[PDB]
């Protein structure tokens, strides 16, 4: 008789609590992702105003 | 510009599948540690000229002269943008991300929330 009761508790909570973890995961990693994303770019265009500037002056 | 300020949670960076960019993810981040630790080091500025010292002392002269006012005076451009689809590649693939997604499995949640209720009779 208790077995099957809390067999089906454990599948329950787990499936939930996967999923509200596997939800707020991909919200906060995109969230991530756009940092740098932007990041990744301007970094080197400054940069290469930056050393451009010595250079041409040079 | 500046600097952008984005902060990156590089675990939850890569993980991503809209499945076109996963791959793209692991390759991105070390794409950007290349152009990371490119920036971070570029000397900021550059020196300029003692104008006034090569003035006198360049005798194909006025050049130095020329060079001063024109060099002084002439200006830059600042490096194009290719792709930043990402501010809305985002945005877009954010709500698929957050809420689209997000509400479905908090629907799929609360269900077994509300059965382990009944699981508790």
Do not use: F, H, P, Q
């Given at each position: 008789q208790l077995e099957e009761v809390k067999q089906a508790s454990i599948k329950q909570i787990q499936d939930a609590i996967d999923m509200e973890k596997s939800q707020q995961a991909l919200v906060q990693k995109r969230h991530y992702l756009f940092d740098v994303q932007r990041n990744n770019i301007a970094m080197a265009l400054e940069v290469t105003y930056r050393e451009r500037l010595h250079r041409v002056y040079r | 510009r500046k600097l952008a300020l984005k902060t990156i949670d590089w675990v939850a960076f890569?993980?991503?599948?809209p499945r076109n960019q996963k791959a793209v993810a692991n390759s991105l981040k070390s794409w950007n540690e290349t152009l990371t630790s490119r920036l971070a080091t570029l000397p900021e500025k550059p020196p300029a000229i003692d104008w006034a010292y090569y003035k006198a002392?360049?005798?194909?002269?006025?050049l130095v002269d020329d060079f001063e006012k024109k060099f002084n005076a002439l200006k830059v451009p600042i490096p194009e943008d290719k792709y930043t689809a990402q501010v809305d590649a985002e945005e877009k693939e954010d709500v698929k991300s957050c809420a689209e997604f997000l509400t479905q499995s908090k629907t799929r949640i609360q269900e077994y929330e509300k059965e382990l209720e009944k699981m508790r009779n």
């Open positions: - | 890569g993980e991503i599948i002392n360049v005798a194909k002269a006025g």
